[PDB]
């Protein structure tokens, strides 16, 4: 205590690491988030790990559905 969402809002307009479901994880600027853990990121960089590999994709604005967010790492 108090609210774990309050510990998130401290990271608004700030760079955050987020691991998603599977071998993909992106980092960017935390613009918005809600109860369900939907987020909006600025200038994000997503990575995909493969063994069968460092694939990177760039975007300036992205909405991520909460259903896929598992882990929010504070730098």
């Amino acid at each position: 205590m108090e609210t774990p969402l309050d510990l998130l809002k401290l990271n608004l307009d700030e760079r955050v690491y987020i691991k998603l479901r599977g071998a993909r994880t992106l980092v960017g600027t935390l613009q918005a988030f809600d109860s369900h853990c939907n987020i909006v990121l600025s200038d994000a960089v997503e990575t995909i790990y493969q063994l069968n590999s460092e694939s990177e994709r760039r975007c300036e604005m992205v909405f991520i559905r909460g259903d896929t967010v598992t882990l929010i790492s504070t730098p």
Partner: protein
């Protein structure tokens, strides 16, 4: 309510909807609902029989956006106001 209202403002701008299965779907956001089910017009699969698509929310992974579409100052002011009302 946040992301519902956020998406309502994004009606008529072209988006790119990443589905959990990797497919791309690029189109004009026409309608939205609470569960974030999306309705797109003039769709095209980037890159290599249109015409509309109702996308069930639970499928979306990403919706890609244009910086200029969004008022970043107002977005995080809304989530600041959202987190407070408890």
């Amino acid at each position: 309510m946040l992301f519902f209202s956020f998406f309502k403002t994004l009606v008529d701008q072209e988006v790119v909807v990443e589905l959990k299965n990797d497919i791309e779907i690029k189109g004009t956001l026409q309608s939205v609902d609470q569960f974030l089910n999306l309705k797109l017009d003039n769709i095209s699969c980037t890159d290599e029989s249109v015409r509309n698509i109702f996308i069930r929310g639970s499928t979306v992974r990403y919706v890609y956006l244009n910086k200029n579409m969004v008022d970043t100052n107002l977005l995080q002011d809304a989530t600041r106001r959202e987190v407070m009302t408890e």
